[PDB]
Structure 1
Amino acid sequence: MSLQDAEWYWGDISREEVNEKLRDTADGTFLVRDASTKMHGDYTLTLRKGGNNKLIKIFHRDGKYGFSDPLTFSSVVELINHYRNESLAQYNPKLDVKLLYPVSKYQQDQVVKEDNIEAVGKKLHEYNTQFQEKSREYDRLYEEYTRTSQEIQMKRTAIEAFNETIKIFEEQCQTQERYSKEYIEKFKREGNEKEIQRIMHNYDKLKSRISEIIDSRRRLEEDLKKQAAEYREIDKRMNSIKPDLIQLRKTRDQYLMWLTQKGVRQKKLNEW
């Protein structure tokens, strides 16, 4: 019935660290530290409620405990377990959850085999090597992902420019036929095939060039189609590497548990 050995007391843990432990958790998940003020015998309880991490200060006086001006309990373990049994709406109706889910310090200690020191000096260096390699691949993916992303929009605006040029050459064809039809028809009955072939020679050269830019557009739309697909492939590959990267980063992290078995960081200093 001691506080130091209790499940939900972690000790010198930082606020940013508990925020990293109640992330997306359920209402009622709770955890206590010694206050960030670093003052002896002064604590803070933080519990999940409404998607928020709500902190409360555990006051201490005359050896008693509590978190309001009227102060009662003998130990924090009595203060907590009381609110594990029934709701803390007694303190404040604005929040009415029980201290349902504790998060403990030395559960999730997922090292199972014979605890030879090589579980650190060997399997830690292994996971950390596996972590920095996969972390280097994800950084490489994100580099060519952003490179491909910008080359795509460069092409999307270039084909959009081709669209405007082709729109302007097509209206040129539709105005060539509008203003040349009845000059062709007039030249036809005057027997002036010479002038008819000047107009046709120029018209042929018009839609000869429009064919070149039309071909240049599809040749770019082809490069775009194929780079847009390799872009989606880079995306799904990153999405596959992210959860793995997090999994073996947490494994590398908790394999410092068995470094903490020695406490003094000699067994990682050797790898330094």
Structure 2
Amino acid sequence: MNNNMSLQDAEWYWGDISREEVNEKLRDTADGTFLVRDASTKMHGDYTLTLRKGGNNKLIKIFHRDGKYGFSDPLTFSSVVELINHYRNESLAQYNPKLDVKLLYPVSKYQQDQVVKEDNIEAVGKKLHEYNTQFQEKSREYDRLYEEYTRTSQEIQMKRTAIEAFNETIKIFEEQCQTQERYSKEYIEKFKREGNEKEIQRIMHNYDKLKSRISEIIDSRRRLEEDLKKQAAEYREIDKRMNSIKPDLIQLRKTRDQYLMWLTQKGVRQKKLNEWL
């Protein structure tokens, strides 16, 4: 039944669509995945075959002359449908060994029909409105989540260099403890000779003043440590939530897109579409 089908009716024939449109369809797909579009009007050739091989898109021009179609002279095929079906059942190695692959998986223009089986325009347009609404909602939810995500990441960064600033501070006040003790062991030891304990209540009142300030600084950077650990937790919690929203987002966009496709076929006025979108 295949070879007599009109090219228009072919599932893998997408008419005049962009290479960019083709690219999105083929993005991250298994080898053998393919479709046909019209060639650029400004170039020689009629149709462009695009298939996946080795994680890359391969574009193969299809030419016409005097009833015959093909990739290169001589043109041996009676129609484009005949060409495709041939390479569905045979490797393109025959055309070129440097790509040994069959056309296994046609990207179908009827795919959405498989998804949306409701045959009523207004009803399909109704679901599209709901699907679009749910998707726009999830999108904004994700947006506010990313906003907090960045703000949190930034405030975590500030706290961290502040922690280092505290450490460096603490290191100095320790060095000052070291300095005073370094120099004291002579004077004090010589000044408990000559019976001066009054020279202590000044020297010692200062040592404990220094030690007190140290404790306060350590206490303050202990605080910042807990604050940071807390906010770092919020960060990872925000990340989790966003990672939950992401899959739902993509699926919602893809379902919306299919319902757009189904309604774009059957030729719904752009105006009617935009009420639903």
Question: Normalised by the shorter chain, which TM-score bucket?
Answer: over 0.9
Quote the offset at 1:261 in angstroms. 4.9
- In structure 2, relative to structure 1, the CA distance for the partners of 1:157 and 1:236 (3 Å cut) is same
Q: Retained in 2: the 8 A contact 1:15–1:36?
A: no
The number of equivalent residue pairs is 272
Q: Retained in 2: the 8 A contact 1:259–1:267?
A: no
For structure 1, the 5+ residue unaligned runs are none
- In structure 2, relative to structure 1, the CA distance for the partners of 1:56 and 1:93 (3 Å cut) is same
- In structure 2, relative to structure 1, the CA distance for the partners of 1:96 and 1:211 (3 Å cut) is same
Q: 1:132 aligns with which of 111, 121, 136?
A: 136
Quote the offset at 1:118 in angstroms. 3.7
Quote the offset at 1:109 in angstroms. 2.6
Q: 1:175 aligns with which of 166, 172, 179?
A: 179
Q: Retained in 1: the 8 A contact 2:35–2:51?
A: yes
Deviations 1:35-56 (A, max 9, x none): 1337898100001011100101
Quote the offset at 1:11 in angstroms. 1.0
Q: Percent identity?
A: 100
Quote the offset at 1:114 in angstroms. 4.7
Alpha-carbon distance in structure 2 between the residues aligned to 1:152 and 1:112: 46
Alpha-carbon distance in structure 1 between the residues aligned to 2:122 and 2:195: 102
- The alignment partner of 1:48 has SS state of strand
Q: Which moved more, 1:78-87 or 1:253-262?
A: 253-262
- In structure 2, relative to structure 1, the CA distance for the partners of 1:124 and 1:74 (3 Å cut) is same
Quote the offset at 1:262 in angstroms. 3.4
Residue in structure 1 matched with residue 248 of structure 2 by the alignment: 244
Quote the offset at 1:198 in angstroms. 1.1
Alpha-carbon distance in structure 2 between the residues aligned to 1:253 and 1:159: 49
Quote the offset at 1:259 in angstroms. 1.9
Q: Retained in 2: the 8 A contact 1:2–1:77?
A: yes
Quote the offset at 1:94 in angstroms. 1.1
Q: Which moved more, 1:211-220 or 1:117-126?
A: 117-126
Quote the offset at 1:111 in angstroms. 4.7
Q: Retained in 1: the 8 A contact 2:33–2:52?
A: yes
Deviations 1:217-268 (A, max 9, x none): 1111111111110011111111111110111111111112442353032673
Q: Retained in 1: the 8 A contact 2:112–2:262?
A: no
TM-score, with normalisation over the residues of structure 1?
Answer: 0.94
Q: Which moved more, 1:111-120 or 1:71-80?
A: 111-120
Alpha-carbon distance in structure 1 between the residues aligned to 2:118 and 2:233: 48
Q: Which moved more, 1:45-54 or 1:256-265?
A: 256-265
- The alignment partner of 1:87 has SS state of coil
Deviations 1:9-66 (A, max 9, x none): 1112211111111111111111110113378981000010111001010011002100
- In structure 2, relative to structure 1, the CA distance for the partners of 1:107 and 1:134 (3 Å cut) is same
Residue in structure 2 matched with residue 110 of structure 1 by the alignment: 114
Q: Retained in 2: the 8 A contact 1:121–1:267?
A: no
Q: 2:198 matched to 1:201?
A: no
Q: Retained in 1: the 8 A contact 2:93–2:100?
A: yes
Alpha-carbon distance in structure 2 between the residues aligned to 1:85 and 1:113: 30
Alpha-carbon distance in structure 1 between the residues aligned to 2:176 and 2:48: 78
Quote the offset at 1:269 in angstroms. 4.5
Alpha-carbon distance in structure 1 between the residues aligned to 2:273 and 2:26: 31
Alpha-carbon distance in structure 2 between the residues aligned to 1:214 and 1:270: 61
- The alignment partner of 1:235 has SS state of helix
Over aligned residue pairs, what C-alpha RMSD do you find?
A: 1.9
Q: Retained in 2: the 8 A contact 1:120–1:256?
A: no
- In structure 2, relative to structure 1, the CA distance for the partners of 1:269 and 1:93 (3 Å cut) is closer
Alpha-carbon distance in structure 1 between the residues aligned to 2:251 and 2:210: 62
Q: Retained in 2: the 8 A contact 1:166–1:210?
A: yes
- In structure 2, relative to structure 1, the CA distance for the partners of 1:123 and 1:236 (3 Å cut) is same
Q: Retained in 2: the 8 A contact 1:120–1:255?
A: yes
Alpha-carbon distance in structure 2 between the residues aligned to 1:107 and 1:144: 38
TM-score, with normalisation over the residues of structure 2?
Answer: 0.92
For structure 2, the 5+ residue unaligned runs are none
Q: Retained in 1: the 8 A contact 2:45–2:62?
A: no
Q: Retained in 2: the 8 A contact 1:27–1:50?
A: yes
Alpha-carbon distance in structure 2 between the residues aligned to 1:256 and 1:39: 31
